[PDB]
């Protein structure tokens, strides 16, 4: 049996997401104290971001950049920091260096996007730009997503030190020397890493259709797809449960998120 048409049932949420407050801020944070922000309960248009000519790096990893307007996401974040030119290639899984080992480390099962642009005309002073720093010495490596704002004195020698600076005891931070005539490669690039996880609240702007039953069509209830015959259901969901599975471990009963009702999925 062949399907007939498609059905989409997203929630009834209308407002837009605070993406201007992450991308268009007046000045970001330095990389050793990277900023972080939760995004929830909003409608996220990723098309308007992807189809700008501004971004000179856009590498989504678990999800492809084209089909971002269709899925639904849980635990969206957004992380803003400032790094050099030849260090954008380290914001990735399984890279090694100084930005990826002492400052900001991405895990291996990563599912997000990595955006960058060139901001030489916004972050660079004619003297010395002493207000973006990065950690240079640390004893060990980092976890995934672990910050370390601690300006305690380091010890590279066998002899101990104290709160003084001397021979073989160093101050752990360091500044970039951003300069409006640095070559392309030492200029300030400006990074935002999105990360999400695949009970959802924030997702894309697909216009909601209306429910048809009792025949073989397509269906999309909160990013979950398939084809099947949406009957009327008898299952008794306690009000925190939404999906529903059998021993064959496929989706067979779904709550319609617009009008709260339990439906069954019998395969065509």
């Amino acid at each position: 049996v062949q399907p007939t048409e498609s059905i989409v049932r997203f929630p009834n949420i209308t407002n837009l997401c605070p993406f201007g407050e992450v991308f268009n801020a007046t000045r970001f944070a330095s990389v050793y104290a990277w900023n972080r922000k939760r995004i929830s309960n909003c409608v996220a248009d990723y098309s308007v971001l992807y189809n700008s000519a501004s971004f000179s790096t856009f590498k989504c990893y678990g999800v492809s950049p084209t089909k971002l307007n269709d899925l639904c996401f849980t635990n969206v974040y957004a992380d803003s920091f400032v790094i050099r030119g030849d260090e954008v290639r380290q914001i990735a899984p399984g890279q090694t260096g100084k930005i990826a080992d002492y400052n900001y480390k991405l895990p291996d099962d990563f599912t997000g996007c990595v955006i960058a642009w060139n901001s030489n005309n916004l972050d660079s002073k004619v003297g010395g730009n002493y207000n973006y720093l990065y950690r240079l010495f640390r004893k060990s490596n980092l976890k995934p997503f672990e910050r370390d704002i601690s300006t305690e004195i380091y010890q590279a020698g066998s002899t101990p030190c104290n709160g003084v600076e001397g021979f073989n005891c160093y101050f752990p931070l360091q500044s970039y020397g951003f300069q409006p005539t640095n070559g392309v490669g030492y200029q300030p690039y400006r990074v935002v890493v999105l990360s999400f996880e695949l009970p959802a609240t924030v997702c894309g702007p697909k216009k909601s259709t209306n429910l048809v039953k009792n025949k073989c069509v397509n269906f999309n209830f909160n990013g979950l797809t398939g084809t099947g015959v949406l009957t009327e259901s008898n299952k008794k969901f306690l009000p925190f449960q939404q999906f529903g599975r059998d021993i064959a471990d496929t989706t067979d009963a779904v709550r319609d998120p617009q009008t709260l009702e339990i439906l069954d999925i019998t395969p065509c």
Partner: antibody, heavy 122, light 107 residues
Amino acid sequence: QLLEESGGGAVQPGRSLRLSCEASGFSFNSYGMHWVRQAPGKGLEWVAAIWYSGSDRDYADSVKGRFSISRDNSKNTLYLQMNSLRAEDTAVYYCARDPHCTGGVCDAFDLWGQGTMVTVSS
Amino acid sequence: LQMTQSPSSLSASVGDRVTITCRASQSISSYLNWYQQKPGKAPKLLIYAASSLQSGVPSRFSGSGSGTDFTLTISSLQPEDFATYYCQQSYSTPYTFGQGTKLEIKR
């Protein structure tokens, strides 16, 4: 948290004085530190600055080659060493702190100090 | 660099708008800070990076502009807002201040 300045009040022309600034209640070594003066009834004016490395520092157009700023991250103090004073180096001197970018304020010195009058006359 | 601040004198009544102008002499960026000095005490920070309010300052003050033209604007005065207003550039060393706009009470 506050920034208190000690330091002298009266010298002859052509001598030396050594000011101080004793910060208390925050992390001293993670900020930059500046000196700003004020001739009596006139506008503000920028004098010196010292940063993280201990060998990077700046001075004005006039006083460069006469003053010498240095810090000491253990006693939480900031020093200024004036040498060969002129007539018109008389003012009230302030110490101020400018943070570095972690999301909040950046390079606008926000916390200030008391002020110690310096009189240079015969 | 050489920053030029005007008007030098001002007199307003309680409940008006005031426009202070501080033009630079070569272009910088969003690097400009605004200070307030009540006579006798230390100065105090209001607007940093040419447009952002500093936490503690009310949302009555608001500055704007970039490039070479910068402007501070109070919406409707209070009796506690009468001082001298300074504008500072953060771009090149030395950091030069302005001249000041002394803000008076009218009767």
